[PDB]
Amino acid sequence: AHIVKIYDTCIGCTQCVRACPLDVLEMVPWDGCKASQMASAPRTEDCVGCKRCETACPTDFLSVRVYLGSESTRSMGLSY
Amino acid sequence: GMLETPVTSAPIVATYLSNLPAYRTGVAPVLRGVEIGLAHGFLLAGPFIKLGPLRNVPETAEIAGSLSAAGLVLILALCLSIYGSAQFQPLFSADGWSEFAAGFLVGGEAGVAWAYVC
Amino acid sequence: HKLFPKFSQGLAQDPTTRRIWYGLAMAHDFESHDGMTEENLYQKIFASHFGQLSIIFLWTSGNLFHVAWQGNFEQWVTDPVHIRPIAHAIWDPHFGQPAVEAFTRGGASGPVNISTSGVYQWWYTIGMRTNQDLYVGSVFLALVSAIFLFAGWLHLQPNFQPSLSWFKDAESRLNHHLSGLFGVSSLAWTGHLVHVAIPESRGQHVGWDNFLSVLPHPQGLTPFFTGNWAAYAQSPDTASHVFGTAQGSGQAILTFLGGFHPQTQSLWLTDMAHHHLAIAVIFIVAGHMYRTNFGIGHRMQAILEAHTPPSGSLGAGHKGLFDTVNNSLHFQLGLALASVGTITSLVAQHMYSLPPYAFQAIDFTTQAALYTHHQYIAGFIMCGAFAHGAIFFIRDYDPEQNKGNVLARMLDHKEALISHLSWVSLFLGFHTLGLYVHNDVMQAFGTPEKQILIEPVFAQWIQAAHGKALYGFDFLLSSKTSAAFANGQSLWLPGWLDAINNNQNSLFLTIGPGDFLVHHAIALGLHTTTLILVKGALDARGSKLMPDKKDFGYSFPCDGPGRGGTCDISAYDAFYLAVFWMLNTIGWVTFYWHWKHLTLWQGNVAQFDESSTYLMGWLRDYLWLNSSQLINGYNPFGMNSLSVWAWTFLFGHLIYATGFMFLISWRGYWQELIETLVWAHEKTPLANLVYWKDKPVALSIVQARLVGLAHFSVGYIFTYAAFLIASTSGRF
Amino acid sequence: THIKPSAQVVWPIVGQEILNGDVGGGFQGIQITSGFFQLWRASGITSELQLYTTAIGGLVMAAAMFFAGWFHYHKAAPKLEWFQNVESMLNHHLGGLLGLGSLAWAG
Amino acid sequence: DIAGLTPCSESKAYAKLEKKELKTLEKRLKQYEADSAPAVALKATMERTKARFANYAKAGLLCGNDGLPHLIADPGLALKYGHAGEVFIPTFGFLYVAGYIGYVGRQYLIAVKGEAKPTDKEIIIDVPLATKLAWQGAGWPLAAVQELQRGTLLEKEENITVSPR
Amino acid sequence: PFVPPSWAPSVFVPLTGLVLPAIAMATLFVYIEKEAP
Amino acid sequence: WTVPTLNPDTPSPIFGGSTGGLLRKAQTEEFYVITWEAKKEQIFEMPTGGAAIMRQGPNLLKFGKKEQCLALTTQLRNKFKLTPCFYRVFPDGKVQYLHPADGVYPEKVNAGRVGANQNMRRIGQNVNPIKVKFSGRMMSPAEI
Ligand code: CLA
Ligand code: CLA
Ligand code: CLA
Ligand code: CLA
Ligand code: CLA
Ligand code: CLA
Ligand code: CLA
Ligand SMILES: CC1=C(/C=C/C(C)=C/C=C/C(C)=C/C=C/C=C(C)/C=C/C=C(C)/C=C/C2=C(C)CCCC2(C)C)C(C)(C)CCC1
Ligand code: SF4
C-alpha cells in the first residue's frame, strides 16, 4: 500500500478528488481555510500511485503527497 | 463476457480436447504421465538423431540422439518435480503431481527406448 | 504470503515477479531491513567483510593452482621473451578438431588459454621458480580463505559478537591499522624481499628448508646494530646481470640506484626493498599518533575542533564533523572509495611507466590488459564514491549537528559549484570539439598545414624539470649546473636520467599536439562526470523542482508527469547518468594509451603524431586498422586462435545493443504486452493447466535503468577487452 | 559511358573548391546520383536551353500554386460539402489525373 | 627553438609538403586545356597554395618533425620569442568580441525588464533599442569595470535558492 | 602429490557446468516459491 | 441514505463479448460489479474495449479492477448525467459496497466524514531522514 498524506496548506479546491482514477480521497468539514473543506485519504489501500492528485493540486508546494510504498495486487493495477 | 468463437467453442474440438490424457478426469496420474511420456519422448527422439552433432557418423547417430533425448526427458521430469514442489503447498495435488512426474519419467524413457528400436 | 525475501515483509507480501528482483537487489542494504538495529548493522558488515576476504584468497589460490597444474611456468622462466604464459586448459566439448588444433598453441598437450593478467612476471619477480612452490602457495591461501570464512561465521556467534563501542573506536583502529596492517606488513615484505626474492634473482634457492642457514648479507646484523647501514648498499647488481643467475651479481640488499634493470627493463629488487623498508618505518611511526588507553596520543575530535580559522571564512570550521564521520557509514565508504579509486588510477599510471616486474613491458598485451583493467576499476570505484556520498546526504546528514561547519557551507554555495563545473565542462567541450572538427576539415580539404596544433609546453616544461633533454629548457634536473642535479648526482639520478632519456620505454613519453588535445578531452570527461556526480550529491536533499526529495529516499522512479514532468530526478539517476560519462572518459584514456603505445611498440611514433590530431585519423588508423586480425579470427576459410576474441567482440556489440533496448524503450509498452501474454496463456487449452505462482509484470523504472546500464557496461568492457587483447596479441 | 553526371559546383573559398572533382566533359563539380540526366535524356531533352525553359515554367507554376493557395483560403474558400464529394473526387482524379496524365505523357 | 621545434622556413618536411601539394594540383591540372575554366581554377588554387606557404614561413611559425605549424600558448615565452600573434593577440581579440556580445545582451535585458511586457520584447525584438545598445557597446570593458566597482554588476542575495540554500 | 588426474576436466567441468547449476537453480526455485507459515 | 444491496439478477448491457474481460483474478481473488439505472437506451463505450447498448432501467457489468469501474462511472456521470455505484465481490459471495461509501459522491463535502491521513503541518516542516532511522522498516519522514 502507498502512503498518501494531506497537509494543512489545502484550500479545499476539490481538484485532487476529481483527479483520482480510483476514488481514494474525499473532502471533509474543516475550519482551516475559507472554503471550509479539507481533503482526506481514508482508502489508501486502493491507491496505485499515479499522482494525478499531485498534478491537480494548485498550492505551492503540494498539499497532497504520494510516497510509493509496498506493492499489492490493487496498487499494481493488476486485472489478473 | 468471453468472445464466442467457433474455435474456442466448437463441439468436435471440445470432444478432442476431452479425449486427450490431460483431461479424462478419473484415470490415475501415473497413467496420464506414462501416456504423455510415451508421446513426447517418442517425438523428441527424432531431431537429435537427424540434426545432432553425430548425425553423419554411421552406427552412432541414433545412439547419441536417443541418449540426448533421454537426458532431456530427465531434465523435463526434474522440471515437473520442482513445479509440483513449488505449486501445491487428483492431478492438482502434491502426491498426484509427484506420481505424474514419475510417470512422465517412466513413459518418456520408455518412448525413447521404443524409438531406438523403431 | 511467501518467505523470500526474509528481510522485507513489504517485499514478501508482493504477489508479483517484482519480489524476486527486489529481494536480489536489496539483500545487502542492511540499513533498511526489518528490525535492523545499529549493533546488528555493524556486526553483519564485519562478517560480510570476512566473506569478501575469503573470496579474495580463494580467487588467488585458484589462480595459483591452475597456473601450477595447467600452465607452462617451469618452462616460461628459462626463456621468458619467446614463450607465452598459459592461464588454464580448455575442456570444451562443443569444439571441433580445427579448434582443438588451433588452441593447442605451445607448449601444451591440449587447448589452453594464453594469460594476459601478468601473474607470471609478478611470481617470477617475487621468487617463484617451480610449480611446487605455486602448489604450496595455493594450498596455503585456500587454508587462509577457510580461516577467514570460519572467522566470519565465528564473530556472529553470541559469545563473539562485538559491542557498538568496539566498532566506533576510531583511534585504536587507526593506530592498529596504520602500525600493523601497513607498516608491519611492509616490513615483513621487506623481509621477504631481502631473505628470498633478492637471493632468488642471484641464482640461489632460498626456501623454507634453508632460509635459517643462508645469510642475506655476508655480514648479517653487524652493520644494522653498528649503524653502518651504508654497508648494505655496497656492491649492487652490475649493469650486465642476467636475472635469475649469478653472472654479474652483487652483494647489496638495500640500494637506491634509480632507473631500471638493463635486461628485464624493470625496477631493481633492492630499490623496492629499501622502498618498503622506509615506508614500513614511516607507517609504524605514523601508527603511534592517536590516543588509546595509554595517556599519550592525539584526540581526533580535539583536532577537528581546533582547525577553525579566524574571520569565519569556513564558518564553524570542522566543528561537529567527528560525529558525522564516526556515526555515518556512507561517509566512511565515500572517503574509502574516493581514496581507493584515486590510488587505483595511481597504480595504473605508475605501473605502465615504471614497470616493477621482470620481463614486464616486453609482454605488451600484459601491459595493455593491466592498464585498462585498473583504469576501469578506478572509474567504477570513483562513481561509487560519489554515489555513497549522495546516500550520506540523504540518510545520515543531520543539519542541526552541522550548523555552520564546512559541510553545511557546501550546501550553501552549491549553485556556484554546479555553475562553475558547468562552465568548465562547456568550455572544454566547445573548444576541444571545435579544434578536432577544424583539423578534420583541414585534413579533408587537403591542407594539413592550416590545422591548429597547440604545443603542450607546460607538460614538456615538467618533463624538462624531471630531466628530459629533448625540449631544451635545461632547468632543475636537465641543467648540469643545478643544485638539485648536483645534489642527487652521486646516488639516484644516473639511473633516472638514463631511463628518462630513453625513447624506447614508457617513462615520460614524448608528447605533442595530439597529446594536448587528448589531455583536454580527458579534462572534459573528468569535469563533466564530476559535474553530474557532484550535482547528484548536492541536489539529493532537494531542488526547486522537488523540495522534499529527501522524503522519498535515494532510489525512487520519478515524481510523476506533473510540474512539467520529473524524469530521472533522484540522486541514483544522476549516478546512472554519470556511469555513461565514466565509461566515455576511461574509453578515451584507454584508446589514447593503447594507440600511443602501439605506435611506440611498432616503431612509428610519427604515425600517432600525424594522425592523432584529427578524429578521422583515430577512426582510420586505430579502430579500422588494428581490427583486421580480430575480425579474421574466424572466416569461411578457417579459424585460428583469435576466433574466441572475435566471438567475444561480437558478443560485446550484442550485449551493448541489448542494453539500448532497456535504456530507450520504457515500461508501459511492456506491461501492456505482458497483459496480452497473460490473456494468451490463460485462454490457451492444455497449457493453462500450468499456471504461474508469481504474477508476471514488467520491470520497474529503476530496475530498467540498472539492467540497461548493466548490459551497456558489460558489452562495453567485453568489446574493448576483445579488441585490445586481440590486436596487441595478434600483432606482437 | 565515360562522363560522370554532375550538376552542383562549389565556390572557391576556404578550400572547399576541392569538392569540384574531375567528373569529365571538361567540367568540375560534385557528381550527382539523383538520376536527373537519364530522365532528361529519356524525355528527349538535348540542349541546356530546353532545361532553362523548363525551369522558368516550373517557377511560373510555383507562383500559380502559391496564388491558388492564397486564393482558395482568403478569397474563394470551398464549402464543406464540396470537400465531401468523394465520388466526384475519385472520378476526376482517376480519369483526369492518372488517366489524362498518362495519356498526355504517352503523347 | 622552443621545445626542439625548427622554424618552418628552415624545416625540410614543410618544403616537402608544399611540393607534394603542388604535385597533386599539377597532376589534376595536366588533364585539361590551357585557357579553360578548370585550368584557371586550378592555377588560382596553386597560387593561393604558394601564397599561403610563403605567408606561414614569413610569420615565423614553428614546425615539428612532420612540417606542420605549431602554436605556443604561454604569454611570456611567446612574447620573448616573437610568437605573440598566434594565441595572445587572438585571445584578447576574442575576449573583446565575446564581452561585447555579452554586454550588449545584458543591457538589452535590463532595458526590457523595466516595461509592462518584458517577455513580449524578448520574443519580438525592439530593433532601434537593440541597434542603439549595439553601437553603444564598444566601451564595454570600461563600463564593465565601472559597474564592477560600484556594486551594481551583481545582484545581492535576493536570488532564488533551494531550502538548504 | 598435488596434481589432479588427466580425467579431471572431463568430470569436473560438466559437473559444475550442468549438474550443480541444475541442483542450484532447482533448490533456489523451491526456496523462492515457499509459502510462509 | 442506507447502504444498497447487490441484485445478481440485474440485466447486463447488450454486448457481444470482448477479449478484455475477466481473468482468473475474478475466480481466485475478487471482481468488481457496477450497477446503474438508465433513463433511455443508448450506446456507451466499454472500458475494456468496444461499444455496448445499455438497457432502459437497471444495468449490471462486472470488471477486473477498480479503475475500470471508475472510468465507466466517470463516463456515465459526465456524459449521460447518471448516478452509478460499483461494488466489490469475493468468490465466497461476500459483497462490499463502496463509491459512494458516504452515499454522497466524494467531490463535495458531507458532514459525518472523519479526516484520515491528514498531517496538520506544512511539507517543509517534516523531519530529516536521520530522525527516523533504525525503525522496524523503511520510513519516509512524513509517516510520523
Ligand atoms: C534458433 C535457431 C536455431 C536452429 C533452428 C538451430 C538448429 C540446430 N542447432 Mg543450433 N544453436 C543456436 C540456434 C539454432 N540452432 C544458437 C542461437 C546457438 C548458440 C547458443 C546454437 C549452438 C549450437 C551448438 C553447440 C549445436 C547446435 C546444433 C544444432 C542442430 C541440432 C540441435 C538439436 O538437436 O536440438 C534438438 C531439437 C529439438 C528439441 C526440436 C524442437 C523444435 C520442434 C521441432 C518444434 C515443433 C513445433 C511443432 C511444429 C508444433 C506442432 C503443434 C502440434 C503438435 C499441435 C540443429 C540444426 C548442434 C549441431 O551439431 O549443429 C549441426 C550442436 O552441437 N546449435
Ligand atoms: C557448460 C556445460 C556444458 C557441457 C559440459 C555441455 C556439453 C555438451 N553439449 Mg552443450 N550447451 C550448453 C552447456 C554445456 N554443454 C549450454 C549452456 C547451451 C546453450 C547455449 C548448450 C547448447 C548445446 C546444443 C544445441 C548441443 C549441445 C551439445 C553438447 C554435447 C557436445 C556435442 C558432442 O559431440 O557430444 C557427444 C554427444 C553425446 C555423447 C550425447 C549427449 C547426451 C548427454 C551426454 C546426456 C547427459 C546425461 C544427463 C543425465 C543429462 C541430464 C543432466 C542434468 C540432470 C544435470 C556435449 C555433451 C550437443 C548435444 O546435445 O549432443 C547430442 C548439441 O546438439 N550443447
Ligand atoms: C567498497 C565496498 C562497497 C560496499 C561495502 C557497498 C555497499 C552498498 N552499496 Mg555501494 N557502491 C560501490 C561500493 C560498495 N558498496 C561501488 C564500487 C559502486 C559503483 C558500482 C557503488 C554504487 C552503489 C549504488 C548506486 C548503490 C549502492 C548501494 C549499496 C548498498 C546496497 C547494495 C545492494 O544491496 O545491492 C545489491 C547489488 C546487486 C544486486 C548487484 C547487481 C549486479 C550489478 C548491476 C552488476 C551486474 C554485472 C554482472 C555481474 C556482469 C556479468 C557478465 C556475465 C557475462 C558474466 C550497500 C550499502 C545502494 C544503496 O545504498 O541504496 C540506497 C545503491 O543504490 N552502491
Ligand atoms: C556524442 C554524444 C554526446 C555529446 C556531444 C554530448 C554533449 C554534452 N553533454 Mg551529454 N550525454 C551523452 C552523450 C553526449 N553528450 C550520453 C550518451 C548521456 C547519457 C544519457 C549523456 C548525459 C549527460 C549528462 C547527465 C550531462 C551531459 C552534458 C553534456 C554537455 C557537456 C558540456 C560540453 O562539453 O559542452 C560543449 C557542447 C557540445 C560538445 C555539444 C556540441 C554543440 C555544437 C558544437 C553547437 C551547435 C553547432 C551547429 C551550429 C548546430 C547546427 C544544427 C542545425 C540543425 C541548426 C555537452 C552538450 C552535461 C551538461 O549539460 O553540462 C553543461 C550534463 O550534465 N550529458
Ligand atoms: C501502372 C502505373 C505505371 C507504371 C508502372 C509506370 C511506369 C513508368 N513510368 Mg509512368 N505514368 C503513369 C503510370 C505508370 N507508369 C501515370 C498514371 C502517369 C501520370 C501521372 C505517368 C506519368 C509518367 C511520366 C511523366 C514519366 C513516367 C515514366 C515511367 C517509367 C519510369 C519508372 C517509374 O515511373 O516507376 C514505375 C512506377 C510504379 C511501379 C508505380 C506506379 C503506380 C501508379 C501511380 C498507380 C498504379 C496502381 C495500379 C492500379 C496497381 C499497381 C500496384 C503496384 C504494383 C504499383 C516507367 C516505365 C517516365 C518515363 O517515361 O521514362 C521512360 C516519365 O518521365 N510516367
Ligand atoms: C597557466 C599557467 C601557466 C604555466 C604552467 C606557465 C609556464 C611557464 N611560464 Mg608563463 N605565464 C602565464 C601562464 C603560465 N605559464 C600567465 C597567465 C602569464 C602572465 C602573468 C605568464 C607570463 C610569463 C612570463 C613573463 C614568463 C613566463 C615563463 C613561464 C615558463 C617558466 C616559468 C617558471 O619557471 O616559474 C614557475 C611557473 C609558474 C609559477 C606558473 C605561472 C607563471 C608565472 C605567471 C610567470 C613565471 C615567470 C618566471 C618567474 C620567470 C622565469 C624566468 C626564466 C628565464 C627562468 C613556464 C613554461 C617564463 C619563461 O618565458 O620561461 C622560458 C617567463 O619569463 N610566463
Ligand atoms: C575460486 C577460483 C577458481 C576459478 C574461477 C576456477 C575455474 C576453473 N576451474 Mg578450478 N579450482 C580452484 C579454483 C578456481 N577454479 C581451486 C582453489 C582448486 C583446488 C581445489 C580447483 C580445482 C580444479 C580442478 C580439479 C578442475 C578445475 C577446473 C576449473 C575450470 C572449469 C570450471 C570447473 O568445473 O571448476 C570446478 C571447481 C573446483 C573443482 C574447485 C572449486 C571449489 C571451490 C571451494 C568452490 C567455491 C564456491 C564458490 C565461491 C561459490 C559457488 C556457489 C555459487 C555459484 C552459488 C575453470 C577454469 C577444471 C579444469 O581444469 O578444466 C580444464 C578441473 O578439472 N579446478
Ligand atoms: C560526494 C561526497 C563525498 C565524496 C567526495 C569525493 C568522492 C571526493 C573525491 C575527491 C578526490 C578524488 C580528491 C583528490 C584529491 C587529491 C589531491 C588534492 C592531490 C593533490 C596532490 C598534490 C598536492 C601533490 C603535489 C605534488 C606533486 C604534483 C609533485 C611534486 C610533489 C608533490 C607531492 C607536492 C564525501 C565522501 C566527502 C561525503 C560528502 C559527499
Ligand atoms: S495517486 Fe493515483 S490514486 Fe493515489 S491519489 Fe493520486 S490519484 Fe488518487
Swiss-Prot record, chain A:
Residue span, 4Fe-4S ferredoxin-type domain: 1-30, 38-67
InterPro entries on file: 4Fe4S_Fe-S-bd, 4Fe4S_Fe_S_CS, PSI_iron-sulfur_center, PSI_PsaC
Substrates-to-products reaction catalysed: reduced [plastocyanin] + hnu + oxidized [2Fe-2S]-[ferredoxin] = oxidized [plastocyanin] + reduced [2Fe-2S]-[ferredoxin]
Matching Gene3D superfamilies: 3.30.70.20
Domain of life: Eukaryota
Ligand binding ([4Fe-4S] cluster 2): C20, C47, C50, C53
GO MF term (any one): electron transfer activity
Its membrane topology: Peripheral membrane protein
Binding site for [4Fe-4S] cluster 1: C10, C13, C16, C57
Co-factor binding details: Binds 2 [4Fe-4S] clusters. Cluster 2 is most probably the spectroscopically characterized electron acceptor FA and cluster 1 is most probably FB.
Stored Pfam families: Fer4_7
Its EC number(s): 1.97.1.12
Any GO BP annotation: photosynthetic electron transport in photosystem I
Enzyme category, top tier: oxidoreductase
Signal peptide: none
GO terms for cellular component: chloroplast thylakoid membrane; photosystem I
Cofactor(s) listed in the protein's UniProt record: [4Fe-4S] cluster
UniProt keywords, alphabetically: 4Fe-4S, Chloroplast, Electron transport, Iron, Iron-sulfur, Membrane, Metal-binding, Oxidoreductase, Photosynthesis, Photosystem I, Plastid, Repeat, Thylakoid, Transport
Subcellular location: Plastid, Chloroplast thylakoid membrane
Complexes and interactors: The eukaryotic PSI reaction center is composed of at least 11 subunits.
HAMAP family: PSI_PsaC
NCBIfam families for the chain: PS_I_psaC
Protein name per the record: Photosystem I iron-sulfur center
Organism name: Chlamydomonas reinhardtii
Curated annotation (Swiss-Prot), chain C:
Lineage: superkingdom: Eukaryota
Keyword set includes Electron transport: yes
Positions of [4Fe-4S] cluster binding: C558, C567
Residues the record lists as binding chlorophyll a B3: M661, Y669
GO biological process, one term: photosynthesis
Documented effect of changing W670F: Still able to photoaccumulate an electron on A1
Subcellular location(s) of the protein: Plastid, Chloroplast thylakoid membrane
List of residues binding chlorophyll a B1: H653
Main location: plastid
Phenotype for C558H: Loss of PSI assembly and function
Effect ascribed to mutating H653 to F/L: Loss of P700 function
Protein name in UniProt: Photosystem I P700 chlorophyll a apoprotein A2
Species: Chlamydomonas reinhardtii
Upper lineage: Eukaryota, Viridiplantae, Chlorophyta, core chlorophytes, Chlorophyceae
Swiss-Prot record, chain D:
Superkingdom classification of source: Eukaryota
Transmembrane segments: 51-74, 90-107
Cellular localisation: Plastid, Chloroplast thylakoid membrane
Family: Belongs to the PsaA/PsaB family.
Function: PsaA and PsaB bind P700, the primary electron donor of photosystem I (PSI), as well as the electron acceptors A0, A1 and FX. PSI is a plastocyanin/cytochrome c6-ferredoxin oxidoreductase, converting photonic excitation into a charge separation, which transfers an electron from the donor P700 chlorophyll pair to the spectroscopically characterized acceptors A0, A1, FX, FA and FB in turn. Oxidized P700 is reduced on the lumenal side of the thylakoid membrane by plastocyanin or cytochrome c6.
Binding partners and assembly: The PsaA/B heterodimer binds the P700 chlorophyll special pair and subsequent electron acceptors. PSI consists of a core antenna complex that captures photons, and an electron transfer chain that converts photonic excitation into a charge separation. The eukaryotic PSI reaction center is composed of at least 11 subunits.
Name by which UniProt lists this protein: Photosystem I P700 chlorophyll a apoprotein A1
UniProtKB/Swiss-Prot annotation, chain E:
UniProt keyword annotations, A-Z: Chloroplast, Photosynthesis, Photosystem I, Plastid, Thylakoid, Transit peptide
Chief localization: plastid
Intracellular or extracellular location(s): Plastid, Chloroplast thylakoid lumen
Keyword flag Transit peptide: yes
Biological process terms in GO annotation: photosynthesis
Keyword Plastid included in the entry's annotation: yes
GO CC term, one of those recorded: photosystem I reaction center
Function (record text): Probably participates in efficiency of electron transfer from plastocyanin to P700 (or cytochrome c553 in algae and cyanobacteria). This plastocyanin-docking protein contributes to the specific association of plastocyanin to PSI.
UniProt record similarity statement: Belongs to the PsaF family.
Record-given protein name: Photosystem I reaction center subunit III, chloroplastic
Portion of the full-length sequence here: 63 to 227 of 227
